[PDB]
Design a protein around this motif. Structure first.
Motif, PDB file in Angstrom:
ATOM      1  N   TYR A  82      -9.454  -9.251   1.147  1.00  0.00           N
ATOM      2  CA  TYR A  82     -10.298  -9.194   2.378  1.00  0.00           C
ATOM      3  C   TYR A  82     -11.655  -9.410   1.869  1.00  0.00           C
ATOM      4  CZ  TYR A  82     -10.536  -4.273   0.551  1.00  0.00           C
ATOM      5  OH  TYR A  82     -10.698  -3.094  -0.258  1.00  0.00           O
ATOM      6  N   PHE A 117      -7.735   9.143  11.460  1.00  0.00           N
ATOM      7  CA  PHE A 117      -9.147   9.296  10.992  1.00  0.00           C
ATOM      8  C   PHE A 117     -10.119   9.971  11.983  1.00  0.00           C
ATOM      9  CE2 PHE A 117     -12.184   7.650   7.730  1.00  0.00           C
ATOM     10  CZ  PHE A 117     -13.392   7.694   8.467  1.00  0.00           C
ATOM     11  N   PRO A 119     -15.161   3.630  10.465  1.00  0.00           N
ATOM     12  CA  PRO A 119     -16.171   2.650  10.121  1.00  0.00           C
ATOM     13  C   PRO A 119     -15.463   1.349   9.897  1.00  0.00           C
ATOM     14  CG  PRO A 119     -16.437   4.610   8.703  1.00  0.00           C
ATOM     15  CD  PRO A 119     -15.119   4.732   9.464  1.00  0.00           C
ATOM     16  N   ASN A 147       0.004  -2.160  14.142  1.00  0.00           N
ATOM     17  CA  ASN A 147       0.544  -0.863  14.480  1.00  0.00           C
ATOM     18  C   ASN A 147       0.165   0.177  13.470  1.00  0.00           C
ATOM     19  OD1 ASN A 147       1.795  -1.105  17.091  1.00  0.00           O
ATOM     20  ND2 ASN A 147       3.700  -1.926  16.091  1.00  0.00           N
ATOM     21  N   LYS A 204      -9.063  11.936  14.476  1.00  0.00           N
ATOM     22  CA  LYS A 204      -8.764  13.349  14.591  1.00  0.00           C
ATOM     23  C   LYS A 204      -9.457  14.171  13.535  1.00  0.00           C
ATOM     24  CE  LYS A 204      -4.833  16.664  15.369  1.00  0.00           C
ATOM     25  NZ  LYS A 204      -3.542  16.855  16.045  1.00  0.00           N
ATOM     26  N   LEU A 205      -9.412  13.798  12.190  1.00  0.00           N
ATOM     27  CA  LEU A 205      -9.827  14.653  11.138  1.00  0.00           C
ATOM     28  C   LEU A 205     -11.274  14.842  11.001  1.00  0.00           C
ATOM     29  CD1 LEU A 205      -7.643  13.288   8.267  1.00  0.00           C
ATOM     30  CD2 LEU A 205      -7.310  15.455   9.566  1.00  0.00           C
ATOM     31  N   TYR A 206     -12.030  13.710  11.195  1.00  0.00           N
ATOM     32  CA  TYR A 206     -13.469  13.734  10.980  1.00  0.00           C
ATOM     33  C   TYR A 206     -14.217  13.709  12.254  1.00  0.00           C
ATOM     34  CZ  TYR A 206     -12.313  12.037   6.111  1.00  0.00           C
ATOM     35  OH  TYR A 206     -11.761  12.068   4.773  1.00  0.00           O
ATOM     36  N   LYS A 207     -13.509  13.493  13.350  1.00  0.00           N
ATOM     37  CA  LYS A 207     -14.073  13.474  14.683  1.00  0.00           C
ATOM     38  C   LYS A 207     -15.254  12.424  14.795  1.00  0.00           C
ATOM     39  CE  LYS A 207     -15.709  16.637  18.460  1.00  0.00           C
ATOM     40  NZ  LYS A 207     -15.112  16.005  19.685  1.00  0.00           N
ATOM     41  N   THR A 208     -15.047  11.255  14.188  1.00  0.00           N
ATOM     42  CA  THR A 208     -16.047  10.157  14.352  1.00  0.00           C
ATOM     43  C   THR A 208     -15.069   8.969  14.279  1.00  0.00           C
ATOM     44  OG1 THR A 208     -17.876   8.918  13.240  1.00  0.00           O
ATOM     45  CG2 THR A 208     -16.216   9.892  11.829  1.00  0.00           C
ATOM     46  N   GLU A 257     -22.079  15.749  10.588  1.00  0.00           N
ATOM     47  CA  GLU A 257     -21.038  15.647  11.623  1.00  0.00           C
ATOM     48  C   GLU A 257     -19.724  15.481  10.933  1.00  0.00           C
ATOM     49  OE1 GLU A 257     -18.829  12.981  13.264  1.00  0.00           O
ATOM     50  OE2 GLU A 257     -18.673  14.780  14.625  1.00  0.00           O
ATOM     51  N   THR A 277     -21.511  -9.447   0.926  1.00  0.00           N
ATOM     52  CA  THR A 277     -20.348  -8.625   0.893  1.00  0.00           C
ATOM     53  C   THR A 277     -19.285  -9.048  -0.091  1.00  0.00           C
ATOM     54  OG1 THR A 277     -19.321  -9.933   2.718  1.00  0.00           O
ATOM     55  CG2 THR A 277     -20.443  -7.694   3.313  1.00  0.00           C
ATOM     56  N   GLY A 279     -15.943 -10.029   3.738  1.00  0.00           N
ATOM     57  CA  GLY A 279     -16.843 -10.292   4.800  1.00  0.00           C
ATOM     58  C   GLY A 279     -17.057 -11.733   4.930  1.00  0.00           C
ATOM     59  N   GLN A 329      -4.549  -2.238   1.525  1.00  0.00           N
ATOM     60  CA  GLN A 329      -3.802  -1.387   0.619  1.00  0.00           C
ATOM     61  C   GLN A 329      -2.339  -1.233   1.001  1.00  0.00           C
ATOM     62  OE1 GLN A 329      -4.607   0.626  -2.765  1.00  0.00           O
ATOM     63  NE2 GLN A 329      -5.445  -1.507  -2.509  1.00  0.00           N
ATOM     64  N   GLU A 369     -10.566  21.734  10.323  1.00  0.00           N
ATOM     65  CA  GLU A 369      -9.162  21.544  10.266  1.00  0.00           C
ATOM     66  C   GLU A 369      -8.453  22.574   9.303  1.00  0.00           C
ATOM     67  OE1 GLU A 369      -7.316  19.571  12.489  1.00  0.00           O
ATOM     68  OE2 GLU A 369      -9.456  19.528  13.145  1.00  0.00           O
ATOM     69  N   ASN A 406     -22.844   1.413  12.126  1.00  0.00           N
ATOM     70  CA  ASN A 406     -23.511   0.623  11.054  1.00  0.00           C
ATOM     71  C   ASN A 406     -23.536  -0.809  11.383  1.00  0.00           C
ATOM     72  OD1 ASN A 406     -23.593   3.161   9.632  1.00  0.00           O
ATOM     73  ND2 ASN A 406     -21.596   2.689   8.637  1.00  0.00           N
ATOM     74  N   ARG A 413      -8.456   0.082   3.956  1.00  0.00           N
ATOM     75  CA  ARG A 413      -7.248   0.876   4.164  1.00  0.00           C
ATOM     76  C   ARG A 413      -6.067  -0.040   4.434  1.00  0.00           C
ATOM     77  NH1 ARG A 413      -8.639   6.382   5.595  1.00  0.00           N
ATOM     78  NH2 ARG A 413      -6.975   6.654   7.282  1.00  0.00           N
ATOM     79  N   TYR A 469     -15.531   5.126   1.411  1.00  0.00           N
ATOM     80  CA  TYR A 469     -15.832   4.806   2.729  1.00  0.00           C
ATOM     81  C   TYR A 469     -17.228   5.071   3.009  1.00  0.00           C
ATOM     82  CZ  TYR A 469     -10.789   5.335   3.165  1.00  0.00           C
ATOM     83  OH  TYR A 469      -9.388   5.231   2.813  1.00  0.00           O
ATOM     84  N   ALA A 502     -14.582   0.768   6.164  1.00  0.00           N
ATOM     85  CA  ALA A 502     -13.531   1.764   5.855  1.00  0.00           C
ATOM     86  C   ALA A 502     -12.176   1.192   6.210  1.00  0.00           C
ATOM     87  CB  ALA A 502     -13.722   3.083   6.603  1.00  0.00           C
ATOM     88  N   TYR A 546     -14.346  -9.160   9.056  1.00  0.00           N
ATOM     89  CA  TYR A 546     -13.446  -9.378   7.918  1.00  0.00           C
ATOM     90  C   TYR A 546     -12.332 -10.343   8.398  1.00  0.00           C
ATOM     91  CZ  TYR A 546     -16.059  -5.548   5.670  1.00  0.00           C
ATOM     92  OH  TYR A 546     -17.085  -4.690   5.178  1.00  0.00           O
ATOM     93  N   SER A 553     -16.253  18.988  10.364  1.00  0.00           N
ATOM     94  CA  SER A 553     -14.898  18.744  10.920  1.00  0.00           C
ATOM     95  C   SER A 553     -13.781  19.041   9.881  1.00  0.00           C
ATOM     96  CB  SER A 553     -14.779  17.374  11.568  1.00  0.00           C
ATOM     97  OG  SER A 553     -15.904  17.079  12.433  1.00  0.00           O
TER      98      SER A 553
END
Lengths: 232, 244, 195, 204, 241, 226, 242, 196, 246
Positions: B153, B95, B104, B86, B97-101, H76, G59, B155, B114, H84, B140, B111, H70, B107, B145, H80
């Protein structure tokens, strides 16, 4: 030991929490309830209790909504809290999206609710399990809530006192209630049979049965009194 | 033993947190869950045990989705397992929303691990009691993981957890030796199934259900989706064939 | 509009206040009360913006009376007057201003004299023995000082007051309907009716 | 116009040889009405003198505020505050309200105990170190007092000769200003002795 | 058990923590206030001394709380330090609001409220400081109080805290006169102090004093810390040096 | 006022007038308008005098704290950025305008800060209301790779030129040469084209010319114990 | 007892037992790190461990690029290595634009020393179990090595090592500076600094390594970059025949 | 004040005029509007100089924290972030920002963010007050995938035209060429550019 | 009991004030001697391996431009406490007071930070007890000790750390009412050579003074209305000279 009780924040040597294991017992000490269902109907039958002959019995069905409602088995003070958040989520669905909530979706929200207290310092695992019935776009469904918060879809299940017997009944008669469709009576009459097996040193009484059924074309309805005396 | 558990952030003269290791003990007791990395995808397979004939199978999953491209499957305690996915879901959403991608895959590992870590850091809150294998396909490429409830964590080419984890890794061991490439996506569906057959010889009391999901570059189009039908039948026939 | 008068004589402070309470374009009541006791020896006449007057009076009444119970003795006029000034100073830096001017006339029982303070609607305290605000201080700062002598009594100060009321009645376009005159001395606070 | 100009008050300091003089009017007026003829604007904390010109509410509020702060400093450190350290302090205290600043124009004057030198410094609304060793003026008639003081000033003066220089400056500048006059007073600080001499002048 | 936090009381409704805070008081030296009709002397005795300790140009158990009222300290100086600051704040607060200096009674009463509250609410600890307060007000005259670390106060005509509590109370009251004078309060102060002090000698480096006087001109209340040179002469007088 | 910034080969020099004027009245004939941030970092205030001196002091303390933290001298950038994020929050509701200039072992740097948060980098800047005045000299007698003497002269001529055209300036010129590897040379009263003339008539009067109503003696000293 | 179970309570010796336990947690990933300074570089090598074959062996990382020009090696546990990484990268980043210039090895390492001390003063949080060694080339102090301990102590070095078998490494570095009479490495291209650091590690344990068994990070003037395994390989064969 | 960016076969070249104008007085005639926010991504600034300056600082800070945490970012991703800050703060700050960077996996790219904040992919963009005048010049003499020299020349000509019909366009024409080979800066004096 | 921060013992005091005090005693010996025109403050260095740099360590840290400090006790707590003192010195009393604070005043603010870290439970007191020496125009040169307990004492000479007791008796003997500043340095070296000999030399011994202003170390020139820094730190070479002179 059994000293790691009084903490819900300490894992035992086997990685169980005693607070949750003791909570499974907590259910058993409450009342029996049987859920069962088809694709056209979902029903809860619940054992009411009196502790004196100057009682008019106490209901064990809380209406969540006009398509949903739920039963309890285990501690009554634990139950009251859970049903408040649950009612809220159905009100949200209607308000913002003009949607009715799914049984499964509601149960994933209640699944979360439990775990908030289980992580934290202080608070409790809940000691009561609810069987949630509703009817959405995916038909009738029946869910079983736990102290842990675990949610399990079953075509019919039972919780509470000596409820292992009612589950045995249901197991034998598995196909019978899945095949029954379009008859609200018939899911109700099967329900009567299952909870008979549960009762020990007692028999089925009218003033004991409370019956709730919700269906395709049927809104949530709670039968009591003189309306369960033709399903006796 | 006694001392330096009761809390999960008290060290011992051996440098080791006891409570947290019991977190790993909880993950063993849960069900056999495996994930396979391929050079174009990832395949997730699970043993969801059949606990009654009154259960309804393949309608209660230990598969969950993150964004629309990251598969997840959990071992351990089931609703703790809900809760951690969740968290994943809020980060994915935020993520994007902010960077619009999309998030990853490297990435994502950072997160999650943590939040697991903020709960092993305080004496007052409990840690998580679940492992989560995860991965998918992104820009990429595929990456896989497995995240331990310890806060760790890495690979993997093949990652396994749960009771039958001793058997499943032994089969995975053949999969790495024999294909350095991690195997094609299509054959790895029928493979994912085989391992779960041979690993339910350690949860043999009960009945089981195999549900398969995948994310593959040119066959699930970089997005996560469930494996069903003829493909599912085949994964079943294949496993069956080779247990016998 | 809403006259309040102060004059300090050598054995009393004689404070006076209006009975016209005007809400609207219509005097809402003919005869009223508009000066209230903080303490048995301190009396506070008030006027200012409409409606702020009732709230403010009651609030100050409560602070003085509280403190008097804690000490177990009645607080000096100095201590009352600086207390009142503070509340208005705080209000002018806040988002609700209170634009009410008062006069504090007590009798000090530790020093043996009347002390009359003038406390402005800005919130400035300065001690003056002929105080007043509004459009009262426009006619009466001059007139009170005319017949004023250094040696005075209650009776000489009263004659001189009544005279002020009549001046105001003549040249202001505001019907005050008369004034109540309350005298403050070491023998308590008493109302004496006046023209 | 500005809240400071309504109510009025001027303050003037001047320096002589090893002395300083700080002087003021007594007139308190709100609007056009005269209230008082006997409210000072000059205070002192230790041997250090503070005059404050401007809006009457902030003169009273700041008299209590700077009385509360210099005493907490004194009690703590057990020795006197100096003019040199106070010049820094006043500015600091003023800059706190920016979006509702105190409408005042202080003057600090004093003689240091650590050198014996005479010291002046001037301040606006939100306060800053404005250094002179000539004279500092402030208030509604600061513009009258800037020219009249400069002329009358001859650098380095005896304490008794300096009384004449401050007095003749202040009198006629106050007088030809509406909201200043009405009595005045001069504090002449020789070093550890302060003589206070009330000017006879026309009450207006 | 009961030797636990503040909030937990005890098998009798006592609190074991207050009694251990009182006992904190006698791990630091003897301090005495004597009220007299011509002035009040406050005295404290040093708790530490060495030949390389600099203590004749400092105080550390005499603090100004304003310009009429002072306190002598007994107990932990680390508990004292925070409380001396708060006390002085409240004392100048009466200056700022009402344009009179605080009564002695209000300054004492607030600190009883402050000490009491840390015990009453939360799981925070009590302190360990006894302050002897000596003040002047026009309505009560000369006034003396002392504070327990418990959160209450009693006024007295003479009072001792600090090490050797019974002995000192006994000497104070023996020669305590009911007219008296300030020069008579100074003499009793030395007399009492010496005997209580475990070191046979008593010298200026072991004494602090401040006297609060109104016999130092009428209409003016003057606080006078006696300097090191004034202590040496009155030791000659009394026979000690 | 008028502030000039002129860089050169071995350092950077900031110079500004010592006249502080608020409104039409010259407040102070002499007052430093050059504010010290850090030992060899300086700035100069124009616009609102109050705002300029207060901010530089407060901020200057932080830069000092940073010096200590780093075990090296501050940076001129450290000053500029700290200022920039402070003045921004307000959005121009503090009228401060400063040229920050200073030296470091990474060079000589020149910057302007603004109220709204704006900035300028050149190898000569001018700022104030006599920014227009100073600019003219700065453009027309500039040279690439100035010497130390040449910059001191250029800064002083540009200010002198602005005394004549911008009436915000006058009085004295104060100058700060900030040279790399060396002390920053504060040269106050560098150039002074102003002159305080002698009186045409001396203004004095004997004791007692003013009329005295009453006199009194007040004390600022503690009373004796007797 | 009560009291080596309590983070902020001192024992009867005035000693803090909790602090001491972090020095006995830091060899829980069983690795030795070696970093030395050239005169135009600071090179960091830690051994890799890839104990399971089910890992994707490429990795696995212990060396972290923290910022543009600034790297870090961790000895000690994975759960505390990640938390340390998030804080050093966050704070490393925050400085740069706040103070408007490139951030020193020294300033960052003090800030983590200060961060670790706050975590141990307070009981709500605990000491981390990682020992951090920062490596960079500073554009105002040159070649630098700072080892930060989890007690909140920090001290610089000329060359350093960490791990369970630190002692063999310690002896190799000490005898080098005794003979050279200098405080860096005299080889003045960073490629020969890589080889040197290898040789001291290979010798100190006694066994040569592979490229799947080392990882090398290389700090150059206003730069940081981590070498891939096939560049590592060029270096090992530089050992095998000179 | 005009800023623009033109894609080409090898990269993207960012072009600007270097005048900073407050009102109608020049603060500094050489202070450039091309400011570096990443190793391979630069940004352009127009509107209030102050408001745009702070906005870049936040973006720059995010993207460096993204490069460590990251991995390295793109054009791109870069766009963004500004958007914001611009979309939330769409009355508090006034900022027209052009974000142009170089990738090896997408080549040079151009995003423009208007005053209120919106995401736009365009192959070239033009912003400022001088951009208005030269809009039809650019439409016609732009080609996709063109030679490096014709790109230099096309930007050089379009900005030279902005100088001609807008009074806050001038200074020098400065340029930043983003390529896989890094960064090449170029400068052009009015004596070269304006004759043409 | 002895054994929380909250609980007072069966014979009073806190056992945690005392444990903090014990932590100082395992520290490295520092000492201060007040002279009659200055203050000299002297300490030693002993750190890690021979590989470790000791020139990248400061156990003499200027708090302010006029006031230096040293410690004994835990190394780590020192740097955070130095960090906290410099910031507080600036914020309440270099902004609201605009110039460098008096020594006495700053000592008092420091003590109150130590006492607040004993006050709130679940936060231990500091491992260190400082010596803070400085100057101002109102109290003169001064020398102080601030204990983690939160109380402060002025001293003529005192020492803390492992070497405390042996140093103390040497100071009672060699100290006098008046000292010159040069005389004070040799007396400092003699005392500190008792705590360790076989590791005493002037490159491994860290020393500073709070004596004269400096016009070359101010960083700017031509204003004689400010003061150069009172604090001056003596380098490795300077200490080596004073030791041939002892």
């Amino acid at each position: 030991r059994n000293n790691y009780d009084g903490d819900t924040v300490t894992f035992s040597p086997t990685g169980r929490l005693f607070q949750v294991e003791y909570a499974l017992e907590a259910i058993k000490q409450g009342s029996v309830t049987v859920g069962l269902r088809s694709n056209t109907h979902a029903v809860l039958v619940a054992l009411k209790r009196n502790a004196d002959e100057l009682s008019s019995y106490q209901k064990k069905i809380i209406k969540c909504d006009e398509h949903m409602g739920l039963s309890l088995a285990g501690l009554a003070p634990d139950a009251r809290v859970l049903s408040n958040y649950l009612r809220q989520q159905c009100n949200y669905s209607s308000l913002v999206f003009n949607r009715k909530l799914a049984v499964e979706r509601a149960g994933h929200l209640l699944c979360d609710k439990a775990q908030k207290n289980t992580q934290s310092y202080g608070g409790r695992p809940y000691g009561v399990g609810l069987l949630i019935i509703g009817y959405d776009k995916s038909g009738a469904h029946l869910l079983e809530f736990q102290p842990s918060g675990n949610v399990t879809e079953l075509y019919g299940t039972a919780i509470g006192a000596r409820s292992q017997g009612a589950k045995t009944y249901l197991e034998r008669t598995l196909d019978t209630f899945i095949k029954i469709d379009g008859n609200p009576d018939e899911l109700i009459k099967a329900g009567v049979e299952a909870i008979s097996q549960s009762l020990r040193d007692e028999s089925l009484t009218v003033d004991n049965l409370s019956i709730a059924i919700v269906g395709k074309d049927t809104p949530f309805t709670i039968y009591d009194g003189e309306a369960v005396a033709k399903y006796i | 033993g006694t001392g330096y558990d009761l809390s999960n952030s008290v060290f011992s003269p051996d440098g080791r947190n006891f409570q947290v290791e019991y977190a790993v003990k909880a993950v063993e007791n849960g069900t056999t869950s495996i994930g396979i990395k391929c050079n174009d995808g990832v395949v997730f397979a699970v043993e969801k045990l059949i606990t009654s004939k009154l259960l309804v199978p393949q309608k209660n999953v230990k598969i969950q989705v993150v964004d629309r491209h990251i598969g997840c499957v959990y071992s351990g305690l089931i609703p703790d397992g809900r809760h951690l996915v969740n968290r994943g879901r809020e980060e994915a959403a935020s993520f994007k929303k902010l960077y619009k991608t999309p998030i990853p895959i490297p990435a994502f590992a950072d997160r999650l691990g943590q939040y697991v870590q903020a709960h092993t850091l305080y004496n007052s809150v409990r840690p998580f009691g679940v492992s989560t294998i995860f991965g998918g396909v992104d820009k990429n490429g595929a990456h896989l993981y497995m995240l331990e409830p310890s806060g760790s964590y890495w690979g993997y080419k093949g990652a396994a957890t749960g009771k039958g984890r001793q058997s499943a890794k032994a089969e995975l061991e053949k999969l790495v030796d024999h294909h350095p490439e991690g195997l094609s996506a299509r054959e790895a569906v029928k493979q994912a199934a085989k391992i779960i057959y041979l690993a339910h010889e350690d949860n043999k009391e009960k009945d089981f259900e195999l549900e398969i999901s995948w994310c593959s570059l040119s066959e699930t189009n970089g997005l996560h989706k469930f494996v069903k039908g003829d493909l599912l039948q085949e994964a079943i026939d294949f496993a069956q064939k080779e247990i016998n | 509009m809403d006259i309040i008068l102060g004059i300090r004589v050598q054995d009393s402070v004689i404070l006076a206040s209006s009975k016209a309470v005007t809400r609207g374009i219509s005097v809402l009541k003919d005869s009223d009360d508009k000066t209230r006791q903080l303490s048995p020896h301190t009396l506070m006449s008030f006027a200012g913006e409409a409606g702020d007057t009732v709230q403010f009076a009651e609030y100050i009444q409560a602070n003085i009376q509280l403190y008097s119970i804690r000490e177990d003795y009645e607080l000096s006029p100095q201590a009352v007057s600086s207390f009142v000034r503070q509340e208005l100073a705080k209000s002018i830096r806040s988002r609700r201003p209170y634009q009410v001017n008062v006069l504090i006339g007590g009798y000090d029982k530790k020093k043996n004299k009347p002390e009359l303070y003038q406390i402005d609607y800005l919130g400035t305290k300065v001690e003056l023995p002929y105080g007043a605000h509004g459009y009262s201080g426009f006619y009466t700062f001059s007139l009170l000082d005319h017949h004023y002598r250094p040696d005075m009594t209650t009776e000489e100060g009263l004659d001189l007051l009544k005279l002020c009321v009549q001046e105001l009645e003549k040249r202001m376009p505001m019907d005050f309907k008369g004034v109540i005159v309350k005298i403050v001395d070491k023998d308590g606070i008493r109302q004496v009716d006046d023209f | 116009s500005d809240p400071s100009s309504i109510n009025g008050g001027i303050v003037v300091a001047m320096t002589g040889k090893d002395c300083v003089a700080i002087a003021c009017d007594l007139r308190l007026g709100s609007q056009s009405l005269g209230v008082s003829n006997k409210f000072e604007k000059i205070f002192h904390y230790g041997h250090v003198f503070l005059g404050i010109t401007g809006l009457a509410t902030d003169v009273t509020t700041l008299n209590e505020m700077f009385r509360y702060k210099t005493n907490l400093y004194k009690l703590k450190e057990e020795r006197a505050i100096e003019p040199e350290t106070f010049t820094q302090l006043v500015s600091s205290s003023l800059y706190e309200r920016r979006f509702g600043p105190y409408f005042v124009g202080p003057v600090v004057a004093g003689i240091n105990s650590k050198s014996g030198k005479p010291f002046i410094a001037g301040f606006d609304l939100i306060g800053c170190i404005d250094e002179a060793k000539d004279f500092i003026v402030s208030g509604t008639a600061s513009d009258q007092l800037f020219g009249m003081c400069e002329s009358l000033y001859e650098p380095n003066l005896e304490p008794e000769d300096l009384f004449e220089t401050i007095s003749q400056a202040l009198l006629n500048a106050a007088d030809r200003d509406a909201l200043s006059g009405w009595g005045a007073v001069v504090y002449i600080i020789k070093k550890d002795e302060v003589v206070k001499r009330y000017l006879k002048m026309r009450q207006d | 058990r009961y030797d636990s936090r503040t909030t937990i009381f005890s098998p009798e409704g006592r609190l074991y923590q207050v009694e251990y805070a009182l006992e904190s008081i006698s791990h630091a030296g003897t301090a005495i206030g004597i009220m007299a009709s011509d002035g009040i002397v406050l005295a404290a005795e040093r708790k530490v001394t060495s030949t390389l300790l600099e203590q004749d140009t400092s105080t550390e158990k005499l603090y100004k709380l304003n310009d009429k009222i002072a306190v002598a300290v007994a107990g932990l100086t680390a508990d004292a330090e925070i409380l001396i600051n708060t006390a002085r704040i409240h004392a100048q607060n009466y200056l700022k609001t009402y344009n009179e200096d605080i009564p002695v009674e209000i300054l004492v009463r607030r600190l009883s409220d402050i000490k009491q509250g840390y015990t009453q609410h939360g799981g925070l600890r009590p302190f360990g400081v006894s302050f002897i307060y000596a003040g002047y007000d026009d309505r009560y005259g000369y006034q003396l109080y002392t504070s327990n670390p418990s959160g209450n106060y009693t006024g007295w005509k003479a009072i001792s805290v600090g090490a050797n509590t019974s002995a000192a109370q006994t000497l104070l009251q023996m020669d305590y006169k009911d007219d008296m004078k300030v020069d008579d309060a100074i003499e009793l102060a030395l007399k009492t102090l010496s005997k209580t002090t475990d070191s046979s000698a008593l010298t200026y480096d072991r004494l602090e004093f401040a006297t609060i006087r109104k016999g130092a001109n009428d209409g003016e209340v003057y606080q006078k810390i006696f300097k090191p040179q004034e202590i040496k002469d009155i030791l000659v007088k009394t026979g000690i040096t | 006022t008028t502030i000039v910034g002129v860089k050169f080969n071995n350092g950077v020099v900031i110079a500004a007038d010592t006249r502080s004027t608020q409104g039409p009245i010259v407040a102070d004939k002499n007052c430093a308008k050059l504010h010290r941030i850090s030992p060899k970092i300086w700035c100069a205030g124009a616009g609102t005098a109050a705002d300029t001196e207060a901010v530089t002091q407060l901020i200057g303390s932080n830069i000092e704290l940073h010096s200590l933290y780093t075990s090296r001298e501050p940076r001129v950038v450290s000053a500029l950025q700290m200022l920039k994020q402070h003045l921004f929050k307000y959005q121009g509701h503090i009228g401060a305008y400063l040229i920050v200039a200073g030296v470091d072992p990474t060079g000589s740097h020149l910057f302007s800060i603004h109220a709204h948060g704006s900035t300028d980098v050149g190898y000569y800047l001018s700022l104030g209301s006599g920014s227009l005045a100073a600019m003219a000299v700065l453009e027309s007698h500039w040279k690439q790779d100035l010497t130390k003497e040449e910059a001191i002269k250029l800064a002083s001529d540009a200010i002198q030129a602005g005394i004549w055209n911008d009436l915000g300036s006058g009085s004295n010129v104060d100058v700060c040469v900030m040279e790399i590897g060396k002390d920053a040379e504060y040269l106050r009263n560098y150039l002074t084209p102003n002159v305080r003339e002698e009186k045409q008539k001396s203004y004095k009067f004997p004791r007692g010319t003013t009329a005295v109503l009453k006199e009194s003696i007040v004390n600022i000293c503690d009373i004796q114990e007797e | 007892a009560g009291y080596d179970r309590h983070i902020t309570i001192f024992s009867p010796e005035g000693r803090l037992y909790q602090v001491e336990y972090a020095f006995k947690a830091t060899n829980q990933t069983n690795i030795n790190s070696l970093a030395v300074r050239g005169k135009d570089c600071t090179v960091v090598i830690s051994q890799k461990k890839v104990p399971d074959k089910l890992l994707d062996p490429t990795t696995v990382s212990y060396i972290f690029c923290i910022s543009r020009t600034i790297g870090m090696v961790v000895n000690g546990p994975i759960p505390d290595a990640r938390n340390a990484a998030l804080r050093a990268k966050a704070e490393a980043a925050e400085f740069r634009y706040k103070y408007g210039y490139d951030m020193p090895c020294d300033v960052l390492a003090k800030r983590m020393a200060n961060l670790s001390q706050i975590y141990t003063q307070r009981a709500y949080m605990r000491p981390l179990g990682v020992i951090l060694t920062f490596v960079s080339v500073d554009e105002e102090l040159g070649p630098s090595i700072y080892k930060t301990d989890p007690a909140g102590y920090y001290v610089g070095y000329k060359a350093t090592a960490t791990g369970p078998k630190q002692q063999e490494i310690t002896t190799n570095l000490e005898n080098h500076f005794k003979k050279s009479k200098i405080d860096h490495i005299n080889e003045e291209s960073w490629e020969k600094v890589v080889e040197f650091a290898i040789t001291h590690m290979i010798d100190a344990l006694g066994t040569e390594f592979s490229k799947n068994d080392l990882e090398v990070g290389v700090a150059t003037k206003d730069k940081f970059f981590t070498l891939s395994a096939e560049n590592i390989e060029e270096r090992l064969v530089a050992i095998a025949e000179q | 004040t005009s800023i623009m960016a033109v894609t080409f076969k090898d990269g993207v070249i960012l072009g600007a005029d270097s005048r900073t104008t407050t009102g109608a007085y020049i603060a500094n005639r050489v202070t450039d509007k091309l400011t570096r926010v990443h190793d391979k991504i630069w940004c352009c600034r127009s509107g209030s100089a102050a408001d745009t300056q702070a906005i870049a600082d936040i973006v720059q800070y995010h993207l460096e924290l993204y490069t460590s945490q990251y991995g390295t970012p793109s054009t791109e991703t870069a766009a963004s972030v500004f958007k914001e800050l611009c979309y939330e703060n769409k009355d508090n700050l006034t900022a027209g920002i052009i974000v142009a960077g170089y990738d090896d996996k997408n080549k040079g790219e151009v995003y423009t963010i208007p005053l209120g904040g919106s995401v736009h992919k365009l192959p070239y963009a033009i912003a400022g007050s001088g951009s208005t005048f030269i809009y039809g010049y650019c439409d016609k003499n732009f080609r996709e995938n063109m030679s490096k020299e014709e790109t230099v020349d096309f930007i050089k000509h379009s900005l030279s035209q902005a100088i001609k019909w807008d009074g806050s366009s001038g200074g020098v024409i400065r340029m930043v060429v983003l390529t896989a080979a890094g960064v090449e800066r170029l400068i052009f004096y009015p004596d070269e550019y304006e004759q043409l | 009991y002895s054994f929380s921060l909250t609980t007072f013992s069966p014979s009073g005091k806190l056992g945690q004030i005392d444990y903090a005090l014990t932590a100082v005693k395992q520290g490295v010996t520092s000492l201060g001697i007040k002279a009659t025109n200055g203050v000299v403050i002297a300490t030693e260095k002993k750190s890690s391996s021979p590989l470790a740099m000791s020139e990248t360590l400061s156990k003499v840290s200027l708090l302010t431009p006029d006031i230096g400090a040293v410690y004994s006790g835990m190394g780590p707590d020192y740097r955070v406490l130095v960090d906290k003192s410099r910031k507080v010195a600036h914020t309440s009393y270099k902004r609201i007071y605009g110039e460098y604070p008096p020594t006495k005043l700053l000592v008092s603010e420091v003590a109150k930070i130590m006492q607040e870290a004993t006050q709130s439970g679940g936060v231990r007191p500091f491992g260190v007890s400082l010596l803070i020496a400085g100057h101002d125009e109102f109290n003169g040169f001064s020398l102080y000790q601030v204990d983690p307990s939160g109380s402060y004492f002025p001293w003529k000479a005192t020492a803390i750390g492992k070497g405390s007791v042996a140093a103390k008796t040497f100071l009672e003997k060699r100290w006098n009412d008046e000292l010159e500043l040069e005389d004070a340095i040799h007396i400092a070296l003699l005392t500190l050579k008792e705590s360790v000999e076989g590791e005493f030399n002037g490159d491994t011994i860290e020393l500073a003074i709070i004596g004269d202003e400096n016009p070359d170390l101010l960083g700017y020139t031509g204003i004689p209305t400010d003061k150069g820094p009172r604090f001056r730190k003596l380098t490795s070479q300077e200490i080596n000279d004073r030791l041939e002179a002892l």
